[PDB]
Write a protein that binds this DNA or RNA. Structure first.
Lengths: 103, 56, 150, 117, 48, 110, 142
RNA sequence: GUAACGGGGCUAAACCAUGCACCGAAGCUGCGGCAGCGACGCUUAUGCGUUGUUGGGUAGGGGAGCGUUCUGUAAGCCUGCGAAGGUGUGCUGUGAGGCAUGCUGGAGGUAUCAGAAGUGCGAAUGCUGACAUAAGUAACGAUAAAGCGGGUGAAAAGCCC
RNA sequence: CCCGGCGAGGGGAGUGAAAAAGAACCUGAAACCGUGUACGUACAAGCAGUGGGAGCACGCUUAGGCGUGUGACUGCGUACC
């Protein structure tokens, strides 16, 4: 069963048996991840609800990895003017694995 | 004339593709012997239509 | 560069180098733009900074228990095997030997020993004194260094 | 003190021509065109982080539109109703149910359509 | 040995510009001298 | 089993040989060996002698059989140039470069 | 991670026959161009032309409305001879009778190549003699 | 060569009067990371907690770090029990860079930290080398031309006869 | 010992620790030309890069929509000094 929850100001789709990634949590590997901020579970049909963060729903998860990705590069540049500068970043994350979601 | 820039090495190869050495489509043997040939010319033994040619 | 002032020249403004002289440094080889000059880097050395830095290292030689102060250290002769058999008995290795007396019979010694070396206490060398494992000293040198920092 | 000059640049080079692997002709093998190519790359690359999202965001509107016109309402009337209707955060990235399993999404379009005045 | 544990006095070390090295460096072209005129060029002409 | 024959100092510019090398890549020795017999060109006999040498050391020594031989590699690299001065307009004394090629044939049963 | 999105292997197309015989050139045209891109249906891809396979039932008799007819003269300069060149509005209906609708929906597709990839799904023929009888075409009202 | 909406198209899909909506930028905002630094708290030699405006930037100033050549601890200690050097890839840092590792290699190497400097090329229509390019392009040097038979020779239109 | 004119060049056999030390021999880049594999190029276009990506080889994908390499196709988009 697929469901939608909020990582923040962005909304994210996830299924059962799915390992999904989001920005890094405080919650550790030997702890429980759970989401009460679920916006629907899309059941057999579209649901007709007004008030979000569905009280009769949770997405239970766990942390499965805390890492950093690959190194992405940012170049800021303006020609003939002798302007060149560089920055890097690798960015932190958490992988969570979803066991929860009622039908 | 001259040229604009030094050209890429794929160009140099497309430019030669029709000027490449072309296949012979197999070879000849005599219709009446086991002597080898040179196609529709006469061998070292005079063989095409007998007689004699090329006594080197 | 000597032995020719020739101009390679053949004008400037014609699809090539300005070509001024055959000896200009950027002309491939034979002599470079900033090649080394004689360096002699020694200074004055400020007496009051010097002697008070030596008070700091000298104090540190008692706080680390490195000031041995062997009493009237000498050997009969400047032979490396007689001094080395003394130093082995006293259980010392790889030491800065301080003569108090600049006596030739210790001062001409230790050469055969790999990490062992002799100097006198008269104007004691401060870059040595901060190196080595221990300072051998005599009681005569210790009297004259407290008096050199006075 | 003769300093060699350039055994550091041999590694800076090899870092650029390695970053320029997959580039065409001289770009993967000549430092001069490699460096240019590298610099231009990271401008687009940082640019397209934001610009992909603004671009996809057009596709999101256009799949919600097609769902909506099948339910005989326009996309701008459908948002303007859902506002008037109580809560839902909603999202334009939500309607996979536009593209696939198109039997759904109707309940949400029909609420918004009803709630309009 | 206690040598090679020394350091300059608090704030004494500026290190100072090397100039003329790289173009992502800040320093590079002109030297900190700007474009043209007598003071961008090598040492000649006018007294102080 | 693999054999190299080289000829260094051979009387050819390398472009005229690279026309032929790219023709016979993956060709197997017998089909190329016919193609060169029914190319009259002097260049085509020049390569034949080194191609024939490649086959002959397979027919003896470390090879065993030469029908299943195929020309796995064929390449040419820059030999030592001899320099001559070309007469040309308004007494231009420009270089003409007299090329040789170091020509390599590799055969194997592999 | 990212949300999932549609892919080239999934495209359905299906066959539509569009009756135009009551209709008008540009309201036929701009609808026709929308279906021919696939913006009538959910694309969810910026680079796959989704769209229909489109049979036009006739469109050989399509009025433009107004006087734009007698000044649609299709200006081109293939490579010869003094003057701008042209073709009458009457040529487009008397000869290759599709062509009034064709180089009207043409101008609604993007730049060079993609607009060739979108296009190769439209056919009009000479008119009302169409040859997708066996496919059994889905009728469509405008 | 349409080419005076950007074009298609619209004789209403126009335009005008009123009015509503949507879309639409690193703007306004949320999530997660981070720099520097004011206030406040802990309360410092070193920081961390909360809160906060802030972080496009050349010329130019200033601060910080790296490596290359060299010294010094390094007269020590590791080495064919596989050193420097080359090279493909993974990791890692804001970047320069650093690290790990298979291949390669048959002798050499080393920080911390301070200090000296011939101290990083891609441009000077820069100097030199190896070596690419236009190219299978142009050339056949007064057309004092040549033949065909034989021969040295492995091979001859040009040699020797 | 094999090939070829008595040739040039290379291989085999045999040497050495090593010939990936074979006589211009020190380990050895990059330009340089060529082979072999994968996958690509005949509805097919512009700084060749960025974003999206069928397909296909390899990685037990730990199958959990991924890694690696290539990549039909296409939205967007003007090199450095």
């Amino acid at each position: 069963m697929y469901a939608v929850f909020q990582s923040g100001g962005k909304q994210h789709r996830v299924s059962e048996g799915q390992t999904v990634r989001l920005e890094k949590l405080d919650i550790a590997t030997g702890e429980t991840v759970e989401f009460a901020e679920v916006l629907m579970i899309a059941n057999g049909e579209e649901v007709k609800i007004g008030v979000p963060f569905v009280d009769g729903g949770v997405i239970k998860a766990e942390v499965v990895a805390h890492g950093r990705g690959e190194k992405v590069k940012i170049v800021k540049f303006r020609r003939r003017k002798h302007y060149r500068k560089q920055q890097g970043h690798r960015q932190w994350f958490t992988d969570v694995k979803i066991t929860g979601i009622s039908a | 004339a001259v040229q604009q820039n030094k050209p890429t090495r794929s160009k140099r190869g497309m430019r030669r593709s029709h000027d490449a050495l072309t296949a012979v489509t197999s070879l000849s043997v005599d219709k009446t012997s086991g002597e080898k040939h040179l196609r529709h010319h006469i061998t070292a033994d005079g063989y095409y239509r007998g007689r004699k040619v090329i006594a080197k | 560069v000597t032995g020719s002032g020739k101009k390679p020249w053949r004008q400037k403004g014609t699809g090539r180098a300005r070509s001024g002289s055959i000896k200009s440094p950027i002309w491939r080889s034979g002599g470079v733009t900033f090649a080394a000059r004689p360096q002699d880097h020694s200074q004055k050395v400020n007496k009051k900074m010097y002697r008070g830095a030596l008070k700091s290292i000298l104090s540190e030689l008692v706080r680390q228990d490195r000031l041995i102060v062997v009493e009237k250290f000498s050997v009969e002769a400047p032979k490396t095997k007689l001094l080395a058999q003394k130093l082995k008995d006293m259980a010392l290795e790889d030491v800065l030997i301080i003569t108090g007396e600049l006596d030739e019979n210790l001062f001409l010694a230790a050469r055969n020993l790999h990490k062992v070396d002799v100097r006198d206490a008269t104007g004691i060398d401060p870059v040595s004194l901060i190196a080595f494992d221990k300072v051998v000293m005599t009681a005569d040198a210790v009297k004259q260094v407290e008096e050199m920092l006075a | 003190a003769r300093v060699k000059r350039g055994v550091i640049a041999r590694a800076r080079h090899k870092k650029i021509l390695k970053q320029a692997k997959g580039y065409y002709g001289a770009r993967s093998r000549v430092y001069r065109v490699a460096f240019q190519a590298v610099i231009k790359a990271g401008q687009y690359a940082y640019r397209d982080r934001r610009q992909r999202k603004r671009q996809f965001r057009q596709l999101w509107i256009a799949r919600i539109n097609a769902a909506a016109r099948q339910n005989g309402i326009s996309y701008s009337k459908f948002i303007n109703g859902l506002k008037k209707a109580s809560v839902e955060i909603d999202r334009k990235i939500l309607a996979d149910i536009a593209v696939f399993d198109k039997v759904a999404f109707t309940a949400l379009v029909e609420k918004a359509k009803a709630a309009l005045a | 040995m206690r040598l090679n544990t020394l350091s300059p006095a608090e704030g004494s070390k500026k290190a100072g510009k090397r100039l003329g090295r790289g173009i992502g460096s800040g320093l590079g072209k002109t030297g900190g001298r700007g474009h043209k005129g007598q003071k961008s060029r090598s040492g000649g002409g006018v007294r102080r | 089993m693999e054999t190299i024959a080289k000829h260094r100092h051979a009387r050819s510019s390398a472009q005229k040989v690279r026309l032929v090398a790219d023709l016979i890549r993956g060709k197997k020795v017998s089909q190329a060996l016919d193609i060169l017999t029914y190319t009259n060109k002097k260049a085509a006999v020049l390569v034949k002698k080194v191609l024939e040498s490649a086959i002959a050391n397979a027919e003896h020594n470390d090879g065993a059989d030469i029908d299943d031989l195929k020309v796995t590699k064929i390449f040419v690299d820059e030999g030592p140039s001899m320099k001559r001065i070309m007469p040309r307009a308004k007494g231009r004394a420009d270089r003409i470069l007299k090329r040789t090629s170091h020509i390599t044939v590799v055969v194997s049963d592999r | 991670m990212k949300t999932f999105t549609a892919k080239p292997e999934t495209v359905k197309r299906d066959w539509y026959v569009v009756d135009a015989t009551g209709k008008t050139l540009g309201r036929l045209a701009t609808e026709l161009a929308r279906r021919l891109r696939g913006k009538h249906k959910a694309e969810y891809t910026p680079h796959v032309d989704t769209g229909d396979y489109i049979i036009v039932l006739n469109a050989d008799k399509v009025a433009v409305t107004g006087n734009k007819r007698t000044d649609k003269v299709y200006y081109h300069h293939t490579g010869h001879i003094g003057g701008i060149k042209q073709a009458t509005f009457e040529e487009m209906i008397a000869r290759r009778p599709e062509r009034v609708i064709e180089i009207a929906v043409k101008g609604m597709l993007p730049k060079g190549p993609l607009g060739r990839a979108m296009f190769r799904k439209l056919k009009v023929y000479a008119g009302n003699e169409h040859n997708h009888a066996a496919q059994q075409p889905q009728v469509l009202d405008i």
